[PDB]
Amino acid sequence: PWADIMQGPSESFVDFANRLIKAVEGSDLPPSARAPVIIDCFRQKSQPDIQQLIRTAPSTLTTPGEIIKYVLDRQKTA
Amino acid sequence: AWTPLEPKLITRLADTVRTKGLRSPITMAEVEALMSSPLLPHDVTNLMRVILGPAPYALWMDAWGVQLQTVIAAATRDPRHPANGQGRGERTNLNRLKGLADGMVGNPQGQAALLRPGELVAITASALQAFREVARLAEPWADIMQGPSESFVDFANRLIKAVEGSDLPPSARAPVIIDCFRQKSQPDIQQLIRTAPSTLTTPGEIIKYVLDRQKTA
Amino acid sequence: AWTPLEPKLITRLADTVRTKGLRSPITMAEVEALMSSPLLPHDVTNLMRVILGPAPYALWMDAWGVQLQTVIAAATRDPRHPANGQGRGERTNLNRLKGLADGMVGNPQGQAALLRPGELVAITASALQAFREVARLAE
Amino acid sequence: PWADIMQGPSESFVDFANRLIKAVEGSDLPPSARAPVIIDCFRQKSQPDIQQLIRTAPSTLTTPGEIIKYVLDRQKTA
Amino acid sequence: PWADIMQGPSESFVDFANRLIKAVEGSDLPPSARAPVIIDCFRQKSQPDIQQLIRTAPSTLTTPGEIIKYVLDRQKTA
Amino acid sequence: AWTPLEPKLITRLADTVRTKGLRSPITMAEVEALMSSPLLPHDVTNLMRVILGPAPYALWMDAWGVQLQTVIAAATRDPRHPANGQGRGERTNLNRLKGLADGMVGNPQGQAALLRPGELVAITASALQAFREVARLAE
Amino acid sequence: AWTPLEPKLITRLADTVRTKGLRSPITMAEVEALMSSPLLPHDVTNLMRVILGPAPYALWMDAWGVQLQTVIAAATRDPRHPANGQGRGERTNLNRLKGLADGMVGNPQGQAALLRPGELVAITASALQAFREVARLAEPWADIMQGPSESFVDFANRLIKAVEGSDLPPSARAPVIIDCFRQKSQPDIQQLIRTAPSTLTTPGEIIKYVLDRQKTA
Amino acid sequence: AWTPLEPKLITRLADTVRTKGLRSPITMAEVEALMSSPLLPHDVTNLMRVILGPAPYALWMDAWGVQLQTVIAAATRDPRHPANGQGRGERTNLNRLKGLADGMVGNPQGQAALLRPGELVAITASALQAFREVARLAE
Amino acid sequence: PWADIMQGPSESFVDFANRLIKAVEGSDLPPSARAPVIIDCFRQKSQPDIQQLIRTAPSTLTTPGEIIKYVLDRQKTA
Incomplete structure (x- = not known):
């Protein structure tokens, strides 16, 4: 179930994005509703450090690929 | 009549x-x-x-x-x-x-x-x-601070009220409101406004930007 | 001839916005009600000045300007706008939409004189969309 | 009776001004004699602290509103 | 001697002005030097309460009579 | 006439990407190998759909679009692009590069019909650079 | 050369x-x-x-x-x-x-x-x-106060320096300097500016007036 | 051709003003010394910016404007001003005296080009009188 | 040697930046390779608090001056 996917405390972001995109594209949603759902799940899941990282984006991110690129650039190396 | x-x-x-x-x-x-x-x-x-x-x-x-x-x-x-x-x-x-x-x-x-x-x-x-x-x-604008627990729309309302109901000329209210948003409005929102990829040149635009990118809590 | 909106209706709408908020469906219905007849820029401006607080009013001025600019771009993209005319001398500038043009600044009677009905309905729809944006943004 | 109105020891100045203007305008004086009477009652009533505050006015106050504004500005906060 | 005249701690201002104008006009000064001397003696003599009262004059006082009128208006009744 | 790439080669390349990763020099060599003949937008799109996971595929779509936009800016900056023609009627739009133009959407045969060899090589180089960017970004 | x-x-x-x-x-x-x-x-x-x-x-x-x-x-x-x-x-x-x-x-x-x-x-x-x-x-204009022992020309110098060397627009410096003269500048000078029979509409005029009528001490 | 004043002389004059004050006869003599050759508005403005503090500089700008206005009143009261000309086209506006006219704002070379020697000496005398007023006022 | 410069546990950031820029500009590197090296040394040296402060930059910093300004703004006052 896509709506139950959370980014674990120790999980990296690319694994979380892979799992989420997999569960969203392999589901019962229409094809035209996958990108907005993936974006809004990146924003509300993806534990509050990345949540604030996406929130304070000086540019407007309108695609899952752009969000992934931005987060991978500005992520907290740890 | x-x-x-x-x-x-x-x-x-x-x-x-x-x-x-x-x-x-x-x-x-x-x-x-x-x-x-x-x-x-x-x-x-x-x-x-x-x-x-x-x-x-x-x-x-x-x-x-x-x-x-x-x-x-x-x-x-x-x-x-x-x-x-x-x-x-x-x-x-x-x-x-x-x-x-x-x-x-x-x-x-x-x-x-x-x-x-x-x-x-x-x-x-x-x-x-x-x-x-x-x-x-x-019955003072330069003494207005955003409280630690206060939301941003309440602070903006209070500040705009005190600035427009004061002795300033009409042509000096917008710059003062902007520069008070930037220096008051406790350092989280201060840094949020500072790191604005766009240049905000109006109190309404600053309010919209902050309401978009604010830390939901 | 310009007729102002009742201050009783405006007071009731202001208290509705004060208790229910900006985003409740009852509030949007009330705004649609008071947005029934095409209003002059003076009317909508004073209405938003009264019902909205200072910061939402600033946000609404911004959003209204942006929506009116989109309207004027569509107008220069189509010479058949109900606000435009056929010749180039009837092209509608943003000073005429925001009520800033000559013979309109501060005077609602002259405003109602020079404005077109298409101008009025475009201004009204723009103001409604701006109100929706600000309401979605404030909370 | 307007000529019997005094500012009490504990009364504020806006209450005294309200009471005095009420009693002077709701009286038998001609309309052209109310402002001078209100001024001269501000000066002689309105217990000696405000009396001296009005006396030492570097500007000449020629209207009850101006006197009220001046006194409200320079009054002893207490 | 005019330059030795001070306003006593208990003396009123009209007595001090009378004494000073008397001693200045009944002296060896030229006639064209009496008014400036009387003014500058009002400003530097006339113990510091009246000194500050004359200093903080929103208008410019350019005559001994005007200074006397101003001080008599705004003086501390005591 | 359009001929598809072998699913055996594509399966081997997908397993190579799965075991070695996106950034290994052997993987880039294999991609260069399968990027030898000029591919149609359909071919490269399906290839990246198969060999890349969902999130790297989104990143790659973004990067490919950006690189194609740079190519189209250079093309409008020089009318002698091997994708362009001499007259203005041969100017190449991004709908024709991404395979979105008329007569191309979903049809590889029509795609191969209308596309130019310069168009194909530009699309291919753009896709290779985008793959390099995404590989450098993913890990 | x-x-x-x-x-x-x-x-x-x-x-x-x-x-x-x-x-x-x-x-x-x-x-x-x-x-x-x-x-x-x-x-x-x-x-x-x-x-x-x-x-x-x-x-x-x-x-x-x-x-x-x-x-x-x-x-x-x-x-x-x-x-x-x-x-x-x-x-x-x-x-x-x-x-x-x-x-x-x-x-x-x-x-x-x-x-x-x-x-x-x-x-x-x-x-x-x-x-x-x-x-x-x-290494802020809205935090500048006139000290209890500081003279007025030093306070005016410091304030004008901090206001002109700041992020305000050029058209908002004079009103801010005036309104900071009025609200800062400890209550003796505050009352001195308040009880001005003339209307002072420029920092230079305010400075001249205060220097004329200041309490010599 | 415009030649700037030595920063060494300006530094010495600034330290003189800092230690002796504004009203000492030695300070006024030094100012008269550095006020010997007719200076352009740029020179006097920067000189007063450097030697005077912020508040005395504001006072001096005010006083300089007032004195220049008196000069321009005398100039419109006499068409034989060494700054004026015989025809009406040479009448000197305050934008030309304060250095605000066209071709002068921020450029000392163009300033020195368009300005008259009578203009320069009038500006210089005005600035000296303004300095005297401010010095008498500050202490 | 520039590649041996670390920000001490007690050293401030402006001193570290001064020392690093000095050692990088007074070295054998080409002129076109100093800015990227200074940036990448700010990111990998400059003990992990400032490392994470630079990592989680919502904007992309592409100049040593911009990095210095950002760090001076958001630094932990202590």
């Missing part, structure tokens, strides 16, 4: 002024509401007589006279005033604005007969500005 | 910056002194290399580039720039302003040959503004 304002609305407005005061934004909104249609000098005079106490009413008469005098100076500085006419015989004297001219003293019907719509709207705007002055006088 | 600045003056200025800091008014006065004649990019670059440390020098290079870019935007917005010419062949590129153009890299003589006097004065003003920015950054 002259129609008086409802005494029910006037009683409700008087009780609003009695409980909330002269300077509350709800009171100014209510006054703007009852200041919607262009009023005759009789209407505004009786309205301020009823809603204001004796001393605020004296202050308001003074301020209204001063603002009307500024209006008449601008009118003699421009013959195209909506209260004026093209020839010199339509020049508007302060006796006609304050309702003191011939055929108007104490008679609202004759008042409504001889007055122009431009005259009415000028009188109304003058009375509103005078009310604002007296309200600011009867 | 290019003449270098004296290393004695440069050494004295460097020691001034070392002891007094970047933001002291004496340091800014000394910089204005050594910024009197229009300098070539070589001169200003070496001057900032010598007087500033490494990190302030990096900051200053950044700020100088930004200010020069604003200048070049204004130049492309007006073909009558004293650095520009009338035809398009005299348009001034940033390589010519930063000294990076052909025939100028590392050579001050050729630099002085090809550069215009308008170019020199624009570069100089840009460098001065960049120095001001970096000095304000390396």
